[PDB]
Design a protein around this ligand. Structure first.
Ligand SMILES: CO[C@@H]1O[C@@H](C(=O)O)[C@@H](O[C@H]2O[C@H](CO)[C@@H](O)[C@H](OS(=O)(=O)O)[C@H]2NS(=O)(=O)O)[C@H](O)[C@H]1OS(=O)(=O)O
Length: 129
């Protein structure tokens, strides 16, 4: 199945998990760190995996995204279809806090606390390769 790219509406960045372990966006679609494999725990719960490094997308306990080496609870995201047909990805562990995966206009991480419903920052188009 897949992989996909996640294209953010905000500045038109593909979500990227760098070998650093840092997360950001790049506009370069032939970047090798933007190819992402999504898998499902339960219905509407995904892990998001870099296929180049095998890292998982994760959000830490204060709202910053990082690449994780293992699929732990900080790696579960709620994928929710929005209008239409972008998805948003809410941190499952901090779901009560409305912490989304987000990129800023310049393609760097938005911090979970700085996110909220209705921002372009949180909208991602999954493009199956
Ligand atoms: C269309 O949507 C957005 O609005 C733009 C804007 O507000 O001029 C732009 O916002 C970025 O800059 C503004 C001020 O210049 C910041 O207030 C905003 O950050 S904040 O979200 O922390 O409050 C910032 N958004 S960011 O790039 O996501 O950090 C931006 O293109 C759009 O922001 S949105 O919230 O995703 O809708």
């Amino acid at each position: 199945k897949k992989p996909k790219l996640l294209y953010c509406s905000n500045g038109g960045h593909f979500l990227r998990i760098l070998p650093d372990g840092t997360v950001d966006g790049t506009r370069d679609r032939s970047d090798q760190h933007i190819q992402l494999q999504l898998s499902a725990e339960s219905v509407g719960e995904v892990y998001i995996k870099s296929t180049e490094t095998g890292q998982y997308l994760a959000m830490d306990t204060d709202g910053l995204l990082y690449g994780s080496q293992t699929p732990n609870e900080e790696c579960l995201f709620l994928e929710r279809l929005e209008e239409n047909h972008y998805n948003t990805y809410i941190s499952k562990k901090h779901a009560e806090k409305n912490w989304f995966v987000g990129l800023k206009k310049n393609g760097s991480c938005k911090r979970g606390p700085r996110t909220h419903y209705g921002q372009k920052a949180i909208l991602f188009l999954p493009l199956p390769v």
